């Protein structure tokens, strides 16, 4: 946990983070994106519950 705490402090791209880096750190990214396309739901739930969203309607 000490080492992990040090890892969060000394390494963290977060001003220029790439989704490619997250796809690399977890294949969960691509798995979920593919599962959503396969599911046929293009609204990922929870996204707008802790990020915004806007609409005209």
């Amino acid at each position: 946990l000490q080492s992990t705490l040090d890892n969060i402090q000394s390494a963290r791209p977060f001003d220029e983070l790439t989704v490619d880096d997250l796809t690399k750190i977890k294949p969960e990214i691509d798995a979920k994106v593919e599962e959503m396309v396969k599911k046929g739901k293009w609204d990922v739930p929870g996204y707008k519950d802790r990020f915004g969203n806007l609409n005209v309607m």
């Binding site: 992990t4 390494a11 791209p13 750190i25």
Partner: peptide
């Protein structure tokens, strides 16, 4: 959460790959 961020933060780069 630990088993998530022992992987995530450990596999973090100092700065990103490129923007």
């Amino acid at each position: 959460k630990r088993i998530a961020n022992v992987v995530h933060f450990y596999k973090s780069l100092p700065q990103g790959p490129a923007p």
